[PDB]
Enzyme design. Structure first.
Site, PDB file in Angstrom:
ATOM      1  N   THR C   1      19.556  27.090   0.360  1.00 42.81           N
ATOM      2  CA  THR C   1      18.239  25.847   0.574  1.00 42.81           C
ATOM      3  C   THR C   1      19.146  24.521   0.628  1.00 42.81           C
ATOM      4  O   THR C   1      19.588  23.899   0.016  1.00 42.81           O
ATOM      5  CB  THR C   1      16.903  25.831  -0.768  1.00 42.81           C
ATOM      6  OG1 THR C   1      16.716  27.192  -1.366  1.00 42.81           O
ATOM      7  CG2 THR C   1      16.518  24.740  -0.539  1.00 42.81           C
ATOM      8  N   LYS C  33       8.688  25.043   3.002  1.00 45.58           N
ATOM      9  CA  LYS C  33       9.620  24.515   1.993  1.00 45.58           C
ATOM     10  C   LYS C  33       9.208  22.406   1.625  1.00 45.58           C
ATOM     11  O   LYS C  33       9.855  21.412   0.917  1.00 45.58           O
ATOM     12  CB  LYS C  33      10.932  23.996   1.238  1.00 45.58           C
ATOM     13  CG  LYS C  33      11.860  25.423   1.399  1.00 45.58           C
ATOM     14  CD  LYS C  33      12.916  25.430   1.496  1.00 45.58           C
ATOM     15  CE  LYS C  33      13.276  26.830   0.978  1.00 45.58           C
ATOM     16  NZ  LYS C  33      14.688  27.279   1.087  1.00 45.58           N
ATOM     17  N   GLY C  45       9.069  17.450  -0.477  1.00 43.18           N
ATOM     18  CA  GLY C  45       9.734  18.901  -0.109  1.00 43.18           C
ATOM     19  C   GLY C  45      10.138  19.106  -1.624  1.00 43.18           C
ATOM     20  O   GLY C  45       9.994  18.149  -2.057  1.00 43.18           O
ATOM     21  N   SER C 124      20.982  23.842  -2.757  1.00 47.60           N
ATOM     22  CA  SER C 124      22.684  25.017  -2.952  1.00 47.60           C
ATOM     23  C   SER C 124      23.266  24.218  -1.588  1.00 47.60           C
ATOM     24  O   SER C 124      24.921  23.309  -0.718  1.00 47.60           O
ATOM     25  CB  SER C 124      22.211  25.586  -2.933  1.00 47.60           C
ATOM     26  OG  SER C 124      22.020  26.667  -0.993  1.00 47.60           O
TER      27      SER C 124
END
EC number: 3.4.25.2
Lengths: 174, 174, 174, 174, 174, 174, 174, 174, 174, 174, 174
Positions: C1, C33, C45, C124
Site C-alpha cells: 500500500t 483507497k 486516503g 508500506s
C-alpha cells in the site's frame, strides 16, 4: 519467483519471471531466470541466487558430457554431488530442466522429480502457475508456449514475488 | 545505512553515509563506507561491518587478478566463495561495486544482481534513495554525481539509521 | 500500500494504489483507497482495512460539522476518540487527509502530524514515494498531480505490496 | 524524542526536538513538542502523540483553575484522572511541566516526579540529555537555556529518534 | 561497564569503571579495566572478560614490536588475526587503546575505528559517557583527566552496569 | 546450587550444597560439589554438571604443573582454553577455586574474577549466601568455616534449588 | 528495588532503596519507597510503580477503618479486592506493611504472608537483604534499625537495581 | 475450504468443496457450503463455521426484505451490523453471494468487495481457484458452471484443506 | 504421508501414499515412497525427503552385505551411523523396512523398534492407519495386502497430507 | 519411560517398562529396556534409543574386561569416552547398572552417580517411582523385587509415557 | 481423550475414555465423559473441562425445550450463543451429541458438523478411533456398541492421553 515448463505436440518450453525481491522491495525486474545449455539441446531455469544456478548449470553440463547427454542420469549425479559436497550443500536453489526426452525438477535435498505430464511449476508462485497450466492443458488445444506464457502472467498477478517480465526458451523436436 | 550508485554520460559514482548505529544510539557518524579498488579502476561500497567488507574487498581484488579485472566473472567467484566457505558464510554485509563496464550488487546469499539502469541502492535507506534517484534520472539532466548526492541526503532525512555525512568515488570513462 | 499527497500552486492531490495483499497473495488490484469528504471540500486516503476507514471517515465528517469544517481541530477530536473508544481502538489504519488549508496525517496512536511541505507518504510504500516526491518537488516545476502520479508509480515498482492502479482526487483553490 | 528542562539563576526552560518517527522512517522533523500554558505562566513539553498531549494539557489548565495555578496539586489531580478514567487511560505520553515554583514529570501510570535539581530529561533520548546537562550544570556557569540547547543537540547526535530541530519556552522569575 | 578516553593539551587518558556484573548481581566492584602496555608508552582498556583482554593485550604488544610500536598498523594486524583465528574469534571484548600519536577502538569484528576527536567511549554506559565528555570538551577548558573522570561518574549514575570505582592511566607528551 | 568461599585468619574454606535439581524435582541430595586438587594444596567447587567440572579440574591441575602451581596464571590458561576449544566451549559450569595465595572465580565466558574480600558465592543461591557472609564477616569475629557454614544454611532456606547437605574443604596456612 | 522489615525489642522498621530503573538506565535515585499510614500507627513499603502503591495504600487505610485498624483482616480484604477488581488486577506491585501487632506481605495474586520472624525482604534485591538480615538477627544484638540499614546497604552492593539511598520509618511499641 | 463464483452468458454460479478440517484431520467431507436464499432468487456460499453462516444468511435475507432485494445495499447493512454488534463481531466467516445484478464478497471486517469480472474465489484454496478460473474465462468459451467446476477440482488437488466434493447453485437470468 | 506394513500368513507388505505437501499446497501426488532392496529380498518405505531415504537405503544395503543380509543387526549399524555422522545427522526421515524374518522401524534418533505384531504405521497419517489395521487384523481373515490397502485409504480420507495414490511391494515366504 | 533398581537382603533388581512413545502416540508397548551383561554377573537398563544403549552396553563390557569387572572404574571409563568421543557424544540415553557391589547411574554428560540407598529411578516417570520405592523400603519388609514391581506399576498409572509391561533381571548374592 | 459415536441397525452409542491428564501426569482415570440428556432421549459426550461441558449441556437442554427437542436446530442455537457470549467464548471443549434422528459435533468456533455415516470421533485420540471404527463398520456386521468399544480400546493403546476406562450410553430406536 515463478517458473513454468510445458510439453505439447513435439514442443517443450520453460518460462520464468524477472522479479528479484529484497525483503519487501524489488531489487531487479529484468532477471533472466531461463537459459539454454549443452550446446542448445537443453533448456533450464532456476529459482534462487543467480550465481548458485550458474554453478549448478555448469556442473550439470559436465554430468551430461560424462553420460552422453542423458538427462535423467546426469540429473541424479548432480543431485548426488549437490547433497554430498560441503560446498554445494550451501547452495539454495530450485532447478528446472528439460530436453526432448523428458522434463524434471532438481532440488538441494538431492530429490529428482518428473511431474505427471512433465508439467513443472516452481518458485513462490509455482502453485499458482500449475493451477492455470493444468486448466489450459486439459481444456484447450493451445501450444505449450501459449500455456506457459498465460500461466506465468496469472502467477504474476497473484504472487507478489512474481512480475510480468518473461524469458522463454522453446525446444522443438516433433 | 544508505549507499547509492548512478551511471550517466560516461560517469559512474558510488556514495554512502557515515552513520554507524548501535541499538538506538549513534556509534560513529563519519564512517567511510566507500573506497576504491583494483588500482583505482574500481569503486565499491558496503553496508555492514567495516572489516567484513575489507575482507571481501581484498578477496574481490584477487578474483579480479585471476580474471584480468573482469567485473562480472570475478563477482560470481566472490559470491561462490562467500556462500561456500564456512568462515566467509559468517560474514554479513551488502556489497556494491561498479566499473566502466557495469554496476552490480553482491550478497551473502551468493546472489549477483545488476539493476535495470545500473542504479544500485542498498542499506536500510536504500529503497529511499532508489526512489529519489529514479525520479531525477528520468526527469532531469543532472549528472550521476548530482543525483547520488541529492538522493543520499533525502535518504538521510528519511532513514533514522542514515546521516548526511557523505563519501563519494567517481569514475569517468566517457 | 502507498498513498501520496502533494500541494503546489494552489492545488493539492491525494493518490493511492489499489493493491490488497493477503500473505503473499494479491487479493484485489482495483481497490479505491482515495475518496472525497465533507461535500467535496476535503480529499482523503487510507492504508488498511476498507471498512475501518469508512467508519473513521464518517465520524471525521461529523467532527467537521461540529467544528464548521476546521480540518486541524476535527482531526484532533478524531484522534482523541480513536485512541479513547474501546471500539475505535481496535481499528488499525493510517489516515491521510487534506483541504485548501493544510495537509495532515492521522494515526491510531492519536498522533496528528502535518509534514514539512504538506508532503504525506504513508503505507508500506510510503517512504519510497516520499523520496521520489521530494526529488521532483525541489528540482522540477511539475504540478502536484504530476508529482504524486510519478511518485506512486515509482513506489509500485519498488514496493511488492503496491501496484500501478491509481486513484486521484485533486482539490483546486488557487 | 528528547525533552530537557533546566532551572538556573531565576530562569527555567523546556526544550525538545521535532522528530516524529514512524517505524524506521522520519514522518516529520519540525514537530512543536514545547508550548506555553495558563496564560503564559507555565511551560510544558510532551513525548508522544500530539493530540494525546493537547488533551492532557487542556485538562491540566482546568486543574490549575480549580487549584488557583498550584502546580503540584494540579499535577496530582491530572495524574489521578489519567489512570482513573477509561478514556484517559488509553492515552500514552510523557508530560513535562514547570513554573517559577518547581519542575516535575507526569506519567500515564499516575506517577508525579520532581527530579533532584529540577532537571527533567525524557523521551527516547532523555537519558543521553540528562548525562550532558548534569555535566554542564555542575562544571559550568552556563545559563539554563544554554544547557538545555547543548544537551538537546548532543542527544540528537546520539539518539536516532531525536533530531536537531529545537523549540524552547523560557520562563524568567528571578 | 564504561570506558572513556580523552586527549587534550598534549595529554591523553583512559578511564574505566570496576563493576563486574553476573546477571542481576554485582560480582566484583574493583575490577582494573585499564592498564599500561609496551613499556609504559601505551595505555589501554577493555570491556569484557578479563582473560580475553590479557590475551589480546599481549598479542598487541607483539604486533607493536613487529611494527616498531606503530599503533595503527599494529591495531590492524591484531584485528586481522582476531577475526581470522578460530581461537581468537571466540573472544568477545571491546578494546580501547591510545598513544601520543592517536586513539582508536578495536573490535572482535576486526573493525578499527578512530573517533572524531579521539574521543572513545565504550561499554554498556559508553554512550552516556560520550554525551558528557562531548559537552565538557567543547564548553570547558578542563584537562583530559578531569573530563574522563567526571564523564565516567555520570555514566555510573546512569548505567546500572557501571559503578564509581575508577582506574586511570594518563600519558603526557606535550 | 550454592557455593561459598571465605578467607580469614590464615584460613580459607569452600562449602557447597548437595542438591541436584531436574526441572521441579530433586534428583540427588548428597552431591559432593567440593573437592581438593593439586596434591591437597588447592580447594575447589563447581556449580553445574559433575563431569563438566571433573574435566575442567583435571586440566586445571595440568595448568598448575606447567605454572608451578601458580593459581592466577593457571586460571587464565584454563579460561583461555575453555572459551577457545570447540569441545570445552560446550561445557557449562561455574568454577570456584582458592589456595593460600588468593581466591577467584572461573567462568565459561573466559572471565577470571577475584572478589573484593576473596568472598566467592556462586550458583543459583550464590547471591543469597554472599549477603549473609558479608554481614557476618564485618560484624562478627567468626572463623571462615563458621561463616561459610551458616551462610550456606541460610541460602538453603531461601533458594529452592539449594539444600542443607554440606561439604567443606578447609585450608590452613596462617 | 529492595525493601526490608525487621522487628526486635519492641521496635519494628521498614527500609527501602530509592533506585528507579528503566531498562538499563537509572531514572531516579531518590525515590521514597517507604511511608506511614493510618495516622502514623502503621508503616509500609512498596516495590513497583509509585502511583500503584498510593492507590493500594489509600484503600488499605479504608480497610483499616472498617476493621478498626486490624492489620491482618484489612490486609485480606485488600488482597481480596486486589485480585477481584478488574481495575486493581492491572496493578503490579509488592506491598510490605507492619504495625505493633505483626508484619506481613501483600501481593497482586491475593496472597497474604507473614514471614517466620516477621522478617520481610522483597524487591529484586529482597532475597539478598533477607540473607544478611537473617545472619545479623541470629548472631548479633543489633537493633532492628541497625539490621535493616546494614542489610539494605549489602543488597545495594549486590543488586544492580538497588542503590544506597535510604528511607526508614521506625515504630516503637515496647 | 474453497468457494468459486463465475458469471458468464446470462448465468452465474457458486461452487464450494465439502471438506471440514480439524487440525490435521478431516472431520467431514460432504459439507454443503452452498445454498439458495431469498426464495430462490439469490445464491450464496460461506467459508467458516456452519452455524456462523446460517446466522448471517438469515439476517441477510431480512436486510433484503427491508431493501426489497437490493443486493448491494443489503450487503452493506449486513457488513455494518457485522462489525458493530458485539454478538456478530465474534463470528468468523467469509461470505460469498450473487444474484442476476452482480456478485460480491462480505467479510467480518465489514468490507464489501465486488471482484473485477464478478469472479469470487475465497477460502484457503481461493487463490488457487482464481488462478484457474481466470485462465479459462479468457481463453475458453466455457460456461460459468464448467469454469467453477474445473477450477474447484484444481483447487482441491492443490489445497490440502479442499476436497473434490462439490455443491453448486446456478442462477440463469439471460 | 502415511506408510503401513502388515505381516500375515507367510506374507508381508509395505504400502504408502504418494502425496508430497509444500506448506498448504500439494507438490506432487504420485510419489513412490516404497521400493525393494537387497536384490528383491527386502521391502522398504520412507516418510521424508526422497533423496534422504535413497541415501539411507543404499547404506542400509551395504550394512546388509557386511552382515549377510541380517535385518536387525544391519538396522542397528545404520541407526548407529545415522546419529553419529555429522552429515547423516542432518537427514530427517522415518524409515520402514521388513523381510521374511521380521519388520522394524528406523529413526534419526538412532532408535530401532519392532512393533508388537510387526505392524508398522508411520508418517503424519501413521497413527490413523495403525488403528484401522489393528481393527481388521483382529476381526477379519483378510490378507496382509488387503489390510494395508484398506488402512491406507482410510488414512488418506482422514489425513490432509495423505492421498489415495498407492505403491505396494509384497514379499511371500510362506 | 521409567526404570527402577532396588537392593535389599542380598538381592538387587532392575525393572523397566516397555512403552515407546512417538509424539503423542504409542509406538511399541513391549520394549525390553532391561538386560543382563558381563556373563550374567551384571544387570542393566536404559531410557532412550534402543541402539544407543546396545552400543554403550557393549563398550561397558569392554571396560569391565579391562578392569576385571570392577563396576565403578569401568563406569568412569565409559562416562569418560561417552563425553569425549565425537561419535558417542551424539548418543542420548540414561543408563542404569548394578552388580553385587553397588548400583549406579551413568549419563551422557559423563556424570556417574550412586544413589543414597542404591535406589535408582530414571526416565520420565523416574521421580514417581522413587517416591513409591522410598515409601515401601522404609515402611515394609518387602523384598527388592516386590518393591521395584509395585513402584513401576504406580509410575505407569501416573506417567503417560510409562506402561505396565515389565521386564526384570534379579541378581542374588546374599 | 477419545470419544466415539456409532449408529447402526436402529442403535446409536457414545463411548469415551476416563483419562484426565495434567502435563505429563495422569490426574484421574475414571472420569465420566459420557452422559444422557433431555429426559434420557439424548446421549452426549465431551472432550475438555468437566464443568465447561456441564454448562453447555445444561443450556443445550434449554435449547431443546425451546425447539421441542429438535437436535439440529438446538445445536445451531447452542453454537450461536457459544461463539457469541463473552462468557461462553472462554469455554474450550469439543461436544458430541446424538439422538434417534442424527449424530453431530459441536465446537467452540460455532461449527456444527454431522459426519458421513454419523461416525463421530473427537479428542486427542479421535482420529485414531475413527480409522478403527471405519474399518469395522465396512468389513463387519458388528453392532454399534461393539464397534465403539473396540475402537476406543485401540485408541487407548495408541493415544498416550487416552486410557481403557469406558463409559457408554446406548440409544435404541429401531
Amino acid at each position: 519467483t515463478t517458473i513454468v515448463s510445458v510439453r505439447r505436440n513435439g514442443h517443450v518450453v520453460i518460462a520464468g519471471d524477472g522479479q528479484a525481491t529484497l525483503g519487501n522491495t524489488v531489487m531487479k525486474g529484468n532477471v533472466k531466470k531461463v537459459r539454454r545449455l549443452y550446446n542448445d539441446k537443453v533448456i533450464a531455469g532456476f529459482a534462487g541466487g543467480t550465481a548458485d544456478a550458474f554453478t549448478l548449470f555448469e556442473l550439470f553440463e559436465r554430468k551430461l558430457e560424462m553420460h552422453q547427454g542423458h538427462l535423467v542420469k546426469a540429473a541424479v549425479e548432480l543431485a548426488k554431488d549437490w547433497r554430498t559436497d560441503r560446498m554445494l550443500r550451501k547452495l539454495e536453489a530450485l532447478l528446472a530442466v528439460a530436453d526432448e526426452t523428458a522434463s524434471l525438477i532438481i532440488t538441494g535435498n538431492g530429490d529428482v522429480v518428473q511431474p505427471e505430464n512433465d508439467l513443472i511449476a516452481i518458485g513462490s508462485g509455482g502453485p499458482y502457475a500449475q493451477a492455470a497450466a493444468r486448466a489450459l492443458l486439459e481444456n484447450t488445444e493451445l501450444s505449450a508456449r501459449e500455456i506457459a506464457e498465460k500461466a506465468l502472467d496469472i502467477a504474476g498477478d497473484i504472487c507478489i514475488y512474481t512480475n510480468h517480465f518473461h524469458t522463454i526458451e522453446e525446444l522443438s523436436y516433433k
